[PDB]
């Protein structure tokens, strides 16, 4: 299986969509990340299933997870990313609002910060418009910066018709 | 041998219940009116009190219902409130999922006082909203066994705990 499909299918990574490798291969989309993660080349090769050009292997795997997360945060602000997250949303992959009166409204992932290492991913309910902590501990080690502070708002700007019927 | 009450409260899914003191149940005046609300009242009460006795199964179900209705009245008394307050301090009922409530402990609450209408929900005194328990193990616990006015009563007696 591809590294991306594998990563996204791991327990705890249910909120991630699979980034189109074509988006990753257009180098301009990754601008700046070359100075934001360790082992940039080896991590990117891993993400793209390229032949690896141990102690180091663990560090490279960690680097790949970080780089993929940062790429993901950018991707979900683009047409493909938004569409894929919208499909996951319709399937309830991110869970449902715990408020009794929101009647299991599906939620969307959101970051309290765009800086890695500041907060773990939270969930935004479009109905009550509040942010919640994931009910499952399997999601408590997923960095919110891989989803971002502006993702839900961008999704609704592009797909206003999904905005809860509570204006 | 373990008491029926300790056995019942220790079962998976019954974590929100406090253990009703026997003396409260032994005072018939506290149980006024319950005989007309559950089947096999006398045998169910004997069972709850560890008193000497398909029918068995139906009586077991009646005892669960009767204990639930007794529990709803008991937790409005100072003793029951104190027991629930201890559980609250330990987080037995869980914490608010709202990020900005900073894991404020919640209390069980019923949306209705009529059995069979709604399962138990959780009330957060910080945001003042009601939530569905995160764990499915609690999704078959009747809210009428906690009641519509329990949280209000607990905070009326112990206002210091209101955020
Ligand atoms: Mg391609
Ligand atoms: Zn909601
Ligand atoms: Zn709250």
From Swiss-Prot, chain A:
Its main location: nucleus. The modification Phosphoserine is found at residues 2, 57. Zn(2+) binds at residues 97, 102, 125, 128. Phosphorylated by alpha subunit. It comes from Homo sapiens (Human). It comes from the Eukaryota. GO terms for cellular component: chromatin; cytoplasm; cytosol; extracellular exosome; extracellular region; fibrillar center; ficolin-1-rich granule lumen; nucleoplasm. It is found in: Nucleus. The chain holds residues 7 to 179 of 215 of the full protein. The KSSR motif is part of a protein interaction pocket that mediates interaction with cellular and viral proteins. This is Casein kinase II subunit beta. Keywords: Acetylation, Disease variant, Epilepsy, Intellectual disability, Isopeptide bond, Metal-binding, Nucleus, Phosphoprotein, Ubl conjugation, Wnt signaling pathway, Zinc. Casein kinase II/CK2 is a tetramer composed of an alpha subunit, an alpha' subunit and two beta subunits. The beta subunit dimerization is mediated by zinc ions. Interacts with DYNLT2. Interacts with CD163. Also a component of a CK2-SPT16-SSRP1 complex composed of SSRP1, SUPT16H, CSNK2A1, CSNK2A2 and CSNK2B, the complex associating following UV irradiation. Interacts with MUSK; mediates phosphorylation of MUSK by CK2. Interacts with FGF1; this interaction is increased in the presence of FIBP, suggesting a possible cooperative interaction between CSNKB and FIBP in binding to FGF1. It is linked to Poirier-Bienvenu neurodevelopmental syndrome: An autosomal dominant neurodevelopmental disorder characterized by onset of seizures in infancy, developmental delay, impaired intellectual development, and poor or absent speech. Regulatory subunit of casein kinase II/CK2. As part of the kinase complex regulates the basal catalytic activity of the alpha subunit a constitutively active serine/threonine-protein kinase that phosphorylates a large number of substrates containing acidic residues C-terminal to the phosphorylated serine or threonine. Participates in Wnt signaling. GO terms for biological process: adiponectin-activated signaling pathway; endothelial tube morphogenesis; negative regulation of blood vessel endothelial cell migration; negative regulation of cell population proliferation; negative regulation of proteasomal ubiquitin-dependent protein catabolic process; negative regulation of viral life cycle; peptidyl-threonine phosphorylation; positive regulation of activin receptor signaling pathway. The modification Phosphothreonine is found at residue 31. Belongs to the casein kinase 2 subunit beta family. One of its GO terms (molecular function) is protein serine/threonine kinase activity. A motif (KSSR motif) lies at residues 135-138. The keyword Lipid biosynthesis does not apply. Signal peptide: none annotated.
Curated annotation (Swiss-Prot), chain B:
A motif (KSSR motif) lies at residues 134-137. Keywords: Acetylation, Disease variant, Epilepsy, Intellectual disability, Isopeptide bond, Metal-binding, Nucleus, Phosphoprotein, Ubl conjugation, Wnt signaling pathway, Zinc. Phosphorylated by alpha subunit. Regulatory subunit of casein kinase II/CK2. As part of the kinase complex regulates the basal catalytic activity of the alpha subunit a constitutively active serine/threonine-protein kinase that phosphorylates a large number of substrates containing acidic residues C-terminal to the phosphorylated serine or threonine. Participates in Wnt signaling. (Microbial infection) Upon infection with Epstein-Barr virus (EBV), the interaction with viral EBNA1 increases the association of CK2 with PML proteins, which increases PML phosphorylation by CK2, triggering the polyubiquitylation and degradation of PML. Seems to also suppress EBV reactivation by mediating ARK2N and JUN at the Z promoter which inhibits BZLF1 transcrition. One of its GO terms (molecular function) is metal ion binding. Zn(2+) binds at residues 96, 101, 124, 127. It is linked to Poirier-Bienvenu neurodevelopmental syndrome: An autosomal dominant neurodevelopmental disorder characterized by onset of seizures in infancy, developmental delay, impaired intellectual development, and poor or absent speech. Its main location: nucleus. Belongs to the casein kinase 2 subunit beta family. The keyword Acetylation applies. It comes from Homo sapiens (Human). The modification Phosphoserine is found at residues 3, 56. The modification Phosphothreonine is found at residue 32. The KSSR motif is part of a protein interaction pocket that mediates interaction with cellular and viral proteins. One of its GO terms (cellular component) is protein kinase CK2 complex. This is Casein kinase II subunit beta. One of its GO terms (biological process) is adiponectin-activated signaling pathway. Casein kinase II/CK2 is a tetramer composed of an alpha subunit, an alpha' subunit and two beta subunits. The beta subunit dimerization is mediated by zinc ions. Interacts with DYNLT2. Interacts with CD163. Also a component of a CK2-SPT16-SSRP1 complex composed of SSRP1, SUPT16H, CSNK2A1, CSNK2A2 and CSNK2B, the complex associating following UV irradiation. Interacts with MUSK; mediates phosphorylation of MUSK by CK2. Interacts with FGF1; this interaction is increased in the presence of FIBP, suggesting a possible cooperative interaction between CSNKB and FIBP in binding to FGF1. The gene is CSNK2B. It is found in: Nucleus.
């Amino acid at each position: 299986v591809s590294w991306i499909s594998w990563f996204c299918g791991l327990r705890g990574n249910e909120f991630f969509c699979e980034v189109d490798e074509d988006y990753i291969q257009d180098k301009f989309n990754l601008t700046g990340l070359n100075e934001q993660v360790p082992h940039y080349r080896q991590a990117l090769d891993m993400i793209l299933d390229l032949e690896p050009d141990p102690n180091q292997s663990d560090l490279i795997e960690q680097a790949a997870e970080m780089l993929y997360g940062l790429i993901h945060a950018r991707y979900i602000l683009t047409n493909r990313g938004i569409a894929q997250m919208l499909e996951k949303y319709q399937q309830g992959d991110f869970g449902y609002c715990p408020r009794v009166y929101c009647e299991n409204q599906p939620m969307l992932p959101i970051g309290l910060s765009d800086i890695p290492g500041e907060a773990m991913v939270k969930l935004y309910c479009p109905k009550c418009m509040d942010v919640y902590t994931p009910k499952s501990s399997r999601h408590h080690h997923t960095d919110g910066a891989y989803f971002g502070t502006g993702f839900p708002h961008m999704l609704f700007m592009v797909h206003p018709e999904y905005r809860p019927k509570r204006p």
